[PDB]
Design a protein around this ligand. Structure first.
Ligand code: BGC
Ligand code: CA
Length: 773
């Protein structure tokens, strides 16, 4: 391996061998059906709201999120980089597809598959990833750096449906070597959203652009129809000419055949036929190829950039709404713009690279933080682009711009709900810290729902009761599902009735105040916008105080985020959240000079604080609640309210000394007595040091709960404890001794390591460990 010295891969990059098998992989621990796409994953490509593409550590384009809100795991074998090499003065060269695998069909059987083991590495530090190719049979060594321009405080390039592939080639040998790198791509118009004749009318064309200071060759893959449907638009692949390099192409090869139409050219001399053919296919799948060929002398290095774009301007949800995607603001809405997106990337990728480095550098260069932590911190951000992310630039048919662009991130794919509020309380930290205009938009979406009333009835899944869908003054659980109508039909969740949950209204308030504090305490307009909704939220929750202790009563059913774990009376969780939310509203009262509100929330806070301490402090920790079976259980999340109060700079809601003791107890029990502290914090533990078995949720580690608990510890000066607590999450996710959840971090696992709900929003909470950014 001499190529690694020629490129700049940080030490904290997640690493795995191309072709490596992994023996210890977790699987779902529920009886019911649940996504398991295996451990062959990698860092995603594509912007926010653009639909994303998951290219795996094996090289295949396999995890498809281009249909917004859906997850389709299937390798499109035609999509690859391939290499040709011939040493000067030998009869024949070698040609090899850079994919550690082979088609399951008999399609493309002429290509050279099964890139060998022990012959390269994959590296990820999102939004960059890299592959190195160090193969006995390839004398010139190659590396590619691939990324999308995902840039904090940038709402433009961050939306783009584009990926750059920057290749570096090095000849360490004493002989001249001819090299070709070829990009192949299937014309994927109809891969989704077409019910029949999925390839019909698809056609490819070649664009040669010789503009100012660049020559670019590209293939544009489209369809002859000018319909404005979810399925229609263009893909493009292409390359920028650099000195010492020639370009060739093939406009059309058949992906539903043996592939020799392309490969017989490539495997001869790494040079394609430059054959155009714009005729449209009917039943056969088609694709295009772009190749570069060059000669490398001993010790010579060369760099050449390829790119991929996809212009699929329309997203469709299951209820029938059709929206334009955010990037159409910058490139247009007609689905004919793939080349423009590509050309932007090819001419500006160096600038985008420097911008990525500029945002990563302050964490990367802090040598007081261990590399493993940097690995998790950056890589968990995969979920922002990958979580079914929807970012609308208008409804189809509207003739003018709206004043706002609505946004939604899925909780996950198995529970297909946008912006789950009990979840985003933990999971939205990267948004507020790095894309705060998106964050504030999401919270304004929630503000607008507060007084929405929907009297229609639904059957509650857990107990078969009938409940009203949406009650005035109660915050919704979510903003809809991709199977229905995101942003229009709310509360898609129906396992419990969220209109009687005791955490949502509080978490809403704390999220509002958080967004103000963490963006510099200057945005009074945001507090003004949200103020009525905050006051309404807290007032409705006060009404759920049955026994007059100043605190909402949990009703003996699961009426909060732990949605099968019953709480009754005053709970540590909902009670601390309530306290913190009252103190937050007092502050907002002060900022907005609203004396009535300030005085009311102060008086409610005083009563409630006093009673909380009395009812639940036991000398070592705070009890789970006042009235349940196992009410003395140690809950890992018992002081979630004080966690948020530290972040919001609201001070002590509970005595300093009592907090410190409860956290040391949580570490001593929930962490260190659960599999030797190597798997995170288990949610519930009996004071005898044994896992609480009152419910499955008590026996789970929640990844986002645990990272948040580490933030809390860290800010209370329990540094060792914080990082040890977080380490178990990292280990399970990324390490060879874990369970193979890289780029699909789940909600939860049990002591055996098996999971629930891969690709989950909550563990974005890791960014709460970085709160001064
Ligand atoms: O694991 C529990 C989670 O399950 C999801 O189905 C719900 O939407 C969340 O509200 C809940 O916190
Ligand atoms: Ca009460």
């Amino acid at each position: 391996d001499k190529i690694s010295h020629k490129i700049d891969i940080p030490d904290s990059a997640w690493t795995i061998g191309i072709g490596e098998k992994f023996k210890n992989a977790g699987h779902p621990n529920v009886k019911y059906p649940m996504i398991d796409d295996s451990y062959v994953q990698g860092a995603p490509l594509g912007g926010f709201g653009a639909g994303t593409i998951g290219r795996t550590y094996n090289g295949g384009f396999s995890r498809w999120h281009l249909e917004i809100g859906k997850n389709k795991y299937t390798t499109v074998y035609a999509n690859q980089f391939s290499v040709f090499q011939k040493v000067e003065g030998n009869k024949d060269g070698v040609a090899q597809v850079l994919y550690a695998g082979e088609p399951e069909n008999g399609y493309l059987s002429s290509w050279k598959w099964d890139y060998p083991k022990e012959s390269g590495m994959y590296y990820a530090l999102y939004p960059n990833s890299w592959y190195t190719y160090t193969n006995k049979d390839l004398p010139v060594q190659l590396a590619v750096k691939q990324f999308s321009p995902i840039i904090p405080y940038n709402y433009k390039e961050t939306s783009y449906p584009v990926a750059v592939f920057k290749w570096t080639a090095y000849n360490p040998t004493n002989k001249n070597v001819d090299v070709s790198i070829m990009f192949t791509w299937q014309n994927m118009i109809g891969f989704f959203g077409k019910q029949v004749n999925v390839n019909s009318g698809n056609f490819n064309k070649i664009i040669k652009d010789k503009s100012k200071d660049s020559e670019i060759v590209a293939a544009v893959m489209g369809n002859i129809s000018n319909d404005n449907e979810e399925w229609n638009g263009e893909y493009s692949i292409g390359v920028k000419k650099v000195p010492g390099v020639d370009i060739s192409y093939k406009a059309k090869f058949v992906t539903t055949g043996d592939g020799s139409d392309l490969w017989h050219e490539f495997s001869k001399n790494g040079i394609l036929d430059n054959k155009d053919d714009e005729t449209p296919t009917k039943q056969d799948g088609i694709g295009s190829a772009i190749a570069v060929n060059f000669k490398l002398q001993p010790g010579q290095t060369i760099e050449v950039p390829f790119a991929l774009s996809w212009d699929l301007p329309i997203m469709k949800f299951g209820g029938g709404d059709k929206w334009y995607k955010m990037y159409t603001k910058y490139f247009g809405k007609n689905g004919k713009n793939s080349f423009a997106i590509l050309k932007e990337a090819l001419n500006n990728y160096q600038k985008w690279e420097k911008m990525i480095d500029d945002w990563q550098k302050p964490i990367l260069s802090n040598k007081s933080k261990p590399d493993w932590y940097k690995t998790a911190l950056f890589n968990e951000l995969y979920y922002l682009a990958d979580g079914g992310t929807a970012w609308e630039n208008g409804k189809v048919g509207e003739k003018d711009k709206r004043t706002n662009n609505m946004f939604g991130l899925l909780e996950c794919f198995d529970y297909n709900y946008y912006e789950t509020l009990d979840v985003r309380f933990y999971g939205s930290f990267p948004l507020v810290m790095l894309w705060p205009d998106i964050e504030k938009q999401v919270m304004r979406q929630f503000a607008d729902t507060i007084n929405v009333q929907d009297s229609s009835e639904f059957k509650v899944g857990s107990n078969g009761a009938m409940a009203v869908k949406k009650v005035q003054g109660m915050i919704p659980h979510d903003l809809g599902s991709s199977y229905a109508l995101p942003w229009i039909k709310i509360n898609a969740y129906d396992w419990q009735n969220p209109n009687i949950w005791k955490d949502l209204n509080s978490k809403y308030v704390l999220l509002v105040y958080r967004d103000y504090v963490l963006t510099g305490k200057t945005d009074k307009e945001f507090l003004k916008y949200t103020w009525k909704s905050v006051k309404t939220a807290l007032d409705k929750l006060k009404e759920m105080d049955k026994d007059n202790d100043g605190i909402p009563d949990n009703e003996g059913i699961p009426d909060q985020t732990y949605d099968t774990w019953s709480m009754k009376g005053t709970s540590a969780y909902c009670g601390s959240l309530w306290l913190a939310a009252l103190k937050a509203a007092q502050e907002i009262g002060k900022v907005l000079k609203d004396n009535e509100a300030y005085i009311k929330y102060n008086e409610w806070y005083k009563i409630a604080q006093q009673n909380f301490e009395k009812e639940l402090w036991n000398g070592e920790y705070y009890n789970f609640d006042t009235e349940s079976d196992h009410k003395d259980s140690i809950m890992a999340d018992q002081l979630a309210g004080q966690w948020y109060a530290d972040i919001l700079r609201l001070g002590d809601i509970l005595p300093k000394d009592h907090v410190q003791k409860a956290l040391k107890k949580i570490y001593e029990f929930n962490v260190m007595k659960f599999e030797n502290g190597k798997m995170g914090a288990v949610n519930g533990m009996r004071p005898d040091g044994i896992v609480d078995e009152s419910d499955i949720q008590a026996q789970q580690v929640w990844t986002g709960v645990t990272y948040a608990l580490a933030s809390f510890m860290k800010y209370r000066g329990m540094t060792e404890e914080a990082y040890n607590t977080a380490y178990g999450v990292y280990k399970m996710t990324y390490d060879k001794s874990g369970k193979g959840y890289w780029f699909r971090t789940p909600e939860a696992w049990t002591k055996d390591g098996n999971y629930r709900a891969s690709m989950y929003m909550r563990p974005l909470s890791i960014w709460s460990m970085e709160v001064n950014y």
